Amino acid sequence: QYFQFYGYLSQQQNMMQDYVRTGTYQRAILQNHTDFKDKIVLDVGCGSGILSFFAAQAGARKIYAVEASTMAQHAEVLVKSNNLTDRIVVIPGKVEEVSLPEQVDIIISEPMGYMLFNERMLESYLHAKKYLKPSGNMFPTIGDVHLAPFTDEQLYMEQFTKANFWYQPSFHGVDLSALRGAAVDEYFRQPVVDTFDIRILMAKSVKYTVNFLEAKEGDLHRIEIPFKFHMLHSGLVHGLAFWFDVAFIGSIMTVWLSTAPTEPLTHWYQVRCLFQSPLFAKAGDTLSGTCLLIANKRQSYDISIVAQVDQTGSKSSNLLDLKNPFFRYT
Amino acid sequence: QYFQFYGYLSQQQNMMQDYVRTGTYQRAILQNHTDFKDKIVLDVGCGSGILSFFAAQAGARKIYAVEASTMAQHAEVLVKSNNLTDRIVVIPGKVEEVSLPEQVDIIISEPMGYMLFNERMLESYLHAKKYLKPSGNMFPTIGDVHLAPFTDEQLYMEQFTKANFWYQPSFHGVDLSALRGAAVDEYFRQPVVDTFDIRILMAKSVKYTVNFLEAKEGDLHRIEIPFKFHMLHSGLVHGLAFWFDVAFIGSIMTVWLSTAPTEPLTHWYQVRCLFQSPLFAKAGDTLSGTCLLIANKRQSYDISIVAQVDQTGSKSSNLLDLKNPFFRYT
Amino acid sequence: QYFQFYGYLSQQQNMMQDYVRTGTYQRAILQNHTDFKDKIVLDVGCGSGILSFFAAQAGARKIYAVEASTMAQHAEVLVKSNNLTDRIVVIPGKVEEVSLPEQVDIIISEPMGYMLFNERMLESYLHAKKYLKPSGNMFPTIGDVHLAPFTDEQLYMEQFTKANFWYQPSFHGVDLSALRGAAVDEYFRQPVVDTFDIRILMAKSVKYTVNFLEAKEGDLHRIEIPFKFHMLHSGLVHGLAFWFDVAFIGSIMTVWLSTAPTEPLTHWYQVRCLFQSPLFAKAGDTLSGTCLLIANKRQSYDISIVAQVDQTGSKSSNLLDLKNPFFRY
Amino acid sequence: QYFQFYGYLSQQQNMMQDYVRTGTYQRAILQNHTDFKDKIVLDVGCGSGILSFFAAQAGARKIYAVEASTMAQHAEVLVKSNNLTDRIVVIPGKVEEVSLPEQVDIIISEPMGYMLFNERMLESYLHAKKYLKPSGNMFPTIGDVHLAPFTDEQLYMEQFTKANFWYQPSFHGVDLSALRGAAVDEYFRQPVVDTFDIRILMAKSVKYTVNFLEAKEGDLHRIEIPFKFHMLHSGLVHGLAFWFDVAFIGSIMTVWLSTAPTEPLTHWYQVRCLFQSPLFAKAGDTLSGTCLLIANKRQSYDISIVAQVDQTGSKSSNLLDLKNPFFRYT
Amino acid sequence: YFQFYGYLSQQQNMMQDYVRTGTYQRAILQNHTDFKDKIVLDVGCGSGILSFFAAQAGARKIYAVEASTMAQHAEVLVKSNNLTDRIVVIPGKVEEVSLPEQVDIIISEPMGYMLFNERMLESYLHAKKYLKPSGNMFPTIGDVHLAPFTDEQLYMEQFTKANFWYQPSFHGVDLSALRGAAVDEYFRQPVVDTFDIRILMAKSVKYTVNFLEAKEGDLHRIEIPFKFHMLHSGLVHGLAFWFDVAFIGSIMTVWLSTAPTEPLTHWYQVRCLFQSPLFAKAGDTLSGTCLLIANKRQSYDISIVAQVDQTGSKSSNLLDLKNPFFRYT
Amino acid sequence: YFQFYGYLSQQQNMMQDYVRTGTYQRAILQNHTDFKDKIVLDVGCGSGILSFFAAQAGARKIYAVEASTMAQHAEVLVKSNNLTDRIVVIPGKVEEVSLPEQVDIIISEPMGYMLFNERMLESYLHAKKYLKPSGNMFPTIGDVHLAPFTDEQLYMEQFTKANFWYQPSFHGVDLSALRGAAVDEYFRQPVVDTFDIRILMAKSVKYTVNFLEAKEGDLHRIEIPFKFHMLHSGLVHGLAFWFDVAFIGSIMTVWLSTAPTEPLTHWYQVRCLFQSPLFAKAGDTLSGTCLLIANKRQSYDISIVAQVDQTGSKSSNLLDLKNPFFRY
Ligand SMILES: Nc1ncnc2c1ncn2[C@@H]1O[C@H](C[C@H](CC[C@H](N)C(=O)NCCc2ccc(O)cc2)CNCc2ccccc2)[C@@H](O)[C@H]1O
């Protein structure tokens, strides 16, 4: 069901129209030509092949382009029509289940999901290091998740407006009221995907770093992100906002791709997890806690956020379902 | 304070734009020309004087046009510009307080309000019979208020949609939830003024008649309307719908002005009093009870509607303030 | 995985907002009170349980409300909070797998999908007849699929315009052109879910009836619909439009729920399947061919349409995937 | 019986949906926490109590929340349900008549009406300084009215289109013409409440400041606003536009709430006073005069505007009734 | 006028009056002996439709005359329908062209608004120079009807529109001085639309023209006296006009009526408003004259003078039939 | 021809374009030193609105020429606004009357659909025989803009609307022989209405007429070359037209635009279809010419020809601007 989605050219078209992402990848690869020139490359989850073509443009000798959806057939068509069949080898299948005839010098991929970790494609990316030669590189090389507390009364009250549909005593004779709390909980469990004005942020971001050269596939099963924010503004904290940056650390240039709200919009937007019970904070208070991601059987994570205002002892605890994201952007 | 808003020509313009009303009054008067020809007329609440002009067109000898608001000054200007100062005498003040130099053959007025009785102007109209000669007439002569049970899921649910604004636990940090019930109650206490399709009615209307020629002021202080509806459709009864007809019973013809939902729309629309607890009825059931209007000090009535489905014993008891209608029409 | 979608109250809220559908069902049930009064009822795929509450309003003795998704848990909460545990028993699971304690007098459901047959829920509905007493009834009792030829130059050309991205000869140094034909093919294979003005229909519709009391589950594995349209307007025929009507044939009255473009809009909208290549026809001409639906493993059908103008003999076909509809509304 | 309509939760809900207003008040209070922390506070015309709740969020020891309408009963319910009985005391009645057992450190209120002064609530706000310590503050602290000449052909001509309803010689046989000029005068006497594009303003605004810490209740009975505009565009001046800003001058930050047409729209919109006789001005001309506001018994003001182009001597004098605004925004 | 008639989009619009076309067909077909083997002149044939009806009734020769370039399209239609032996299209004005042969019957649709507009009836009468002794004419006679009406909404509309000019500063310009002239202009326009018969205040009066007897010159000055017996009281806002024609064949008489009690035609009905309305009591008498004088622009200058005999109130009105207001929507 | 302009109802309708009226008033009032104590000529004044604006800017004297019986209403307005000294109404066509004084500036609204319809620009230019060598014209220049568009619905309507003519037995008559001619007729109608800018497939090309420099005879034959760089792939169904004018004063230049990106005016925009649509890919070039030849009926015969340069594919049409189709 995950991979069927990706078999449609309508879907590929949509994915290729992120010009920030595509330009940044092309630059990371082309400006680090000595990391590709005459090298063996693995492209994990190539779709229609775009990153593999960039690797070929940078002079790679062979690129193994692995794709688990029927999009592999279309990649094969483009490889031939662009006269690169000697240089890009399309491999249908999951990177966990295919065979490479050869170890590689560098792995390239776009494994980032919403909040960095959605899709659990980072685990596939890390799994693929079994094909990596000693002292081989990975593009992207490291990933930083950023989180910061926000206030947004409008977003917060939206959840109740929607749930209150159920708070009526005679819907064609039926009293729906008993489901209102369940509706509220469900909406608050959905991470909210859209952008926002940076003015809603109440403290400087905290980060959590994954070095993909060092990290092990298993490490991503249980991710514990601690935080201690020093509040720069007084107000109601309605949740945490998330974005991420990744770096392509080449031998010539380090290139960054950012999905920060201070940067041009990408197809990852930003993500906000709401607290059903908001926390009041004054300037100078400290908002501490932990965000815990546990991998689930649906290409996703269960999210647990507990935060407290240290100076008052008010706590808020929040469970979210990263497999039911709410796409709010317009 | 009550008559202030009637002093404005913008408001007079709006009232004159009901062409169903204006045209029906003109027909009733002109077609009953022998009821006006060389007679003395009293116009109760003449506004800018339009009904008095109609009486004049039908050949009245003299018309005393009584007006409580500053609109009286504007009527006097129209009378003069229409070269009728000899035949229409504008008397500023309440019909209960002014003096007429003589008795009249016929009284004409537009005393009907929402649900017929709102404004308590019917009492002013009846009071004015102290000026009426024996066997004089009144136009309108009788009025029939009709009530029928309706179903309307959208209108009913709208009340909770609006009250649920208060059902939120952190409106800028404030828990508003405790006011939800009071907000619901307030909305249901407002009779709804708008129109509707006749297919929402669930039984044939019951009526209650006032003969303006025989009735006295005292009969309008406590208005008791029993009802027994034979339900023609099964479903949820959300309230009673109200409209009214008046007849101008002249010597030549009887002309009706109807505000029913089967008839062209007037500025009275129709009125619906909702039940906060709807009643389930099957076709063939009997919905019985009492609509009781008690006159109050704000030119209106305290409404009490008590209804029950006889076969099931489910009951609904409802209090409404006709002083504060919700104008819903768009 | 399929049923996970249905477990969300947001989705249920969206579904409940089809007031044409809900009001018609309530009417069908309440006006046919003798088909429910003191009867045993099966509600197939009850969601939050609304149809079951209607059967209870009509006086049913006992209603078994079967729901495959976790929405069953919410249905249960509503039955308890509405003081109806006496009369409605919620059974979590598919209707094909659960056990009921007794046979029933009437089955009620909303098994219709896009183009009537999508979801293959009609099969689950027919399957539920193993619980039905002899001379028991079903609500809906019959369903008619309707098809008619349409002209819509905007819709047809969109299929190519949407593929324009693929013409790029240098998308960051990559020629995408070789995939443009495939993008176009893919788009043409999507049935189009939206509504339209009836002025685009070039002939009175042809129908196909499924009688839910007579039909067997297996009859819906291969559905063959022939047509011969008599054209009432001249023009280009870009494809076939589909909608459906169901009838609740009660002892007291027959109530119809229609999704025709002449009736108020429902959450099923209407569906249009394009021909690869449009066909010209003049008023008075006839258009004939067949529509074949074959059930697949993804809760849907492969649709084959072949049609021709009888006079000129212009031929067009298409093979569409009802599992990948385009929601154009 | 001015306060009747404020006792309705439906009215309170409408008022509470001005999010610019609510957010700006909360920010002003929370960022100036030291002006509230452990202090005594008076809230004048608290309605449902929202500002009192913000003052409690900022750490106030005791808040006296005064409210003249039956909304006072609903505030008391919110105080109980938000667990603040020990800190917020609701006092039903007019601030001019109630007893307070204690002097206060700060007064908070939303006394502003259309054109700043409508409602005459500013007088009540100033009246309440009898409770304010000499060291105390008021939120808001100052208010600035801004006025500027505008051109708007469509607005100007609409008044005549409306009045021309009366310019007809046989409305069911009646010549209505003699009322046309009175209708025109009536429409021009109504200040227009709605918004507009700033491109209609023909000169930079002039302002008139009221310092709520300095002013006396009595200074608001007669308000004389002199103006002199240096015209920046040639054209016809159809009247004066008005808006207002208030500043909350805290010991920590000064926060502004603006109702300017360059700013996000509030429930005060902007107000335009039309000239029945427009004034022609060239760029570089000076348009001078006075706007005089005289308080009246209807909780409003009689407005007099006298304007001249200094270079040509072309004059315009206009009288308006702020008690009868026309709400044009749709 | 003839430029306008040259367009096929205009022809299409003209041909879509089904009441008119059907009635002309029944008149011609049902009087088949009036046509069977006869010589026909068709005055102003357009694309030729009436000539085709005459052929269908078995006429031997039909001379179809048309002044616009639509005559070229009529020629095409005749050839394509293989009727060149029996229908001869002659391009030009019937006044000026040549016919080889005298004819048994003339057919035409010479009726305009209020019957007389276009003055095409003078071309129809002029054509009789080609008519044999004992020849016929379809239509044979025409009746115009007039009746007083009351319509507050229509009346007041004229002032609402004219009151645009009643303002003292339209971008600095006082427009007021033109309000009276605008009012007069609107009241000079006959109003083309339909209405409910309940607005009529007296039984109609009629004026008849016998096309067999009448000469071209009889229509330069048309004087229509009237005396109405007012059946209802109210304000008389003007006169409503309509017409009937009869086709008097030897087998049957067929009527085409444009009355407000009859199915709508493309002529609708016409109302001439009175700027000063007249108050009438039931039983009063409204008398006066409607006078039509021919003008250079294919039309008439209209004068209506009316008074209520019992009160002496008079209303005098001038109208321009060359600038009708098409109000029908 | 001018008869329909004689009616106040038609003048009311024209006065309701507030974008037009406001822009002209701004042009004039902001350039007050161009009018102050000057002599002005107003070509086709109608009820006289622009002449009043020149008066507001302080003009000494304004000659307002009007060819229809609207001239009588203008003189009424002039007199009622107490301006009979300053504004002189001259009934007649400006080409058929003499004026008593040279002028410092000519004001007019000579633009028609596609800028040129009505041929009133020739009248505007003709009036330059009274303009002093140093004088100005308001508007001073006019740019007609064209761009290729895609609109399959508009294309198909030309055929659909002719379906009436297919019928082989309309009351026993076969109409089929006329359907072709019916289609050709609809095709020759330029289409007046508005549309979404998203239908445009390339950036516009312009053709400028400078009113200070042009001669009347220059407008008898107008050739407009174009080369479009296509920004989108797909079918080109025709060319869209609109126009801008500039009032180039000594103080400010004010533009009045009828573009589909601007608020709608009573000129709307105009579209002319090709008989057959052309396919082009993004990056292709679409080149051709629009040729306008003035005709006897105050209009133009329009010839449009286009080709895709990379493929040699061609279409064209010949349109009649005297018979536009008002679609809006
Ligand atoms: N002297 C007084 N003493 C006590 N109690 C008073 C006094 N004067 C006014 N009270 C009360 O005070 C309240 C009005 C407060 C202020 C209303 C404010 N001036 C406003 O929005 N004016 C524009 C809307 C409008 C109003 C009237 C009108 O004719 C036209 C337009 C509400 N503040 C607190 C607040 C803040 C945010 C959200 C909601 C509320 C009412 O409840 C009055 O009963």
Author numbering:
A (entry chain C), B (entry chain B), D (entry chain A): 148 to 477
C (entry chain D): 148 to 476
E (entry chain E): 149 to 477
F (entry chain F): 149 to 476
Can you quote the paper on this entry?
The SAM analogs 2a and 5a were thus characterized as SAM-competitive, substrate-noncompetitive inhibitors of CARM1. To further seek a structural rationale for 5a and 2a for CARM1 inhibition, we solved the X-ray structure of CARM1 in complex with 5a with resolution of 2.00 Å and modeled the CARM1 binding of 2a. The overall topology of the CARM1–5a complex is indistinguishable with the V-shaped subunit of the CARM1 dimer in complex with SNF and 1 (details in the next section), which is typical of the Rossmann fold of Class I methyltransferases. However, 5a adopts a noncanonical pose with its 6′-N-benzyl moiety in a binding pocket that used to be occupied by the α-amino carboxylate moiety of canonical ligands such as SAH, SNF and 1, while the α-amino methoxyphenethyl amide moiety of 5a protrudes into the substrate-binding pocket. This noncanonical mode is consistent with the SAM-competitive character of 5a. In contrast to the noncanonical mode, Arg168 in the CARM1–5a complex adopts an alternative orientation (two possible configurations), accompanied by an altered conformation of Glu257, to accommodate the 6′-N-benzyl moiety of 5a. The α-amino amide moiety of 5a also engages CARM1 through the combined outcomes of a hydrogen-bond network and hydrophobic interactions with nearby resides. Interestingly, the overlaid structures of CARM1 in complex with 5a and a substrate peptide implicate a steric clash and thus a potential for binding competition between 5a and a CARM1 substrate. However, the apparent substrate-noncompetitive character of 5a suggests that this steric clash might be avoided if there is no significant energy penalty when the substrate Arg adopts alternative conformation(s). The distinct modes of interaction of CARM1 with 2a and 5a also rationalize the CARM1 selectivity of the two SAM analogs over other methyltransferases, including closely related PRMT homologs.
Protein arginine methyltransferases (PRMTs) act on their substrates to yield three different forms of methylated arginine: asymmetric dimethylarginine (ADMA), symmetric dimethylarginine (SDMA), and monomethylarginine (MMA), which are the terminal products of Type I, II and III PRMTs, respectively. Among the important Type I PRMTs is CARM1 (PRMT4), which regulates multiple aspects of transcription by methylating diverse targets including RNAPII, SRC3, C/EBPβ, PAX3/7, SOX2/9, RUNX1, Notch1, p300, CBP, p/CIP, Med12, and BAF155. The requirement of CARM1 is implicated in multiple cancers, with its methyltransferase activity particularly addicted by hematopoietic malignancies and metastatic breast cancer. Mechanistically, CARM1 methylates Arg1064 of BAF155 and thus facilitates the recruitment of the BAF155-containing SWI/SNF complex to a specific subset of gene loci that are essential for breast cancer metastasis.
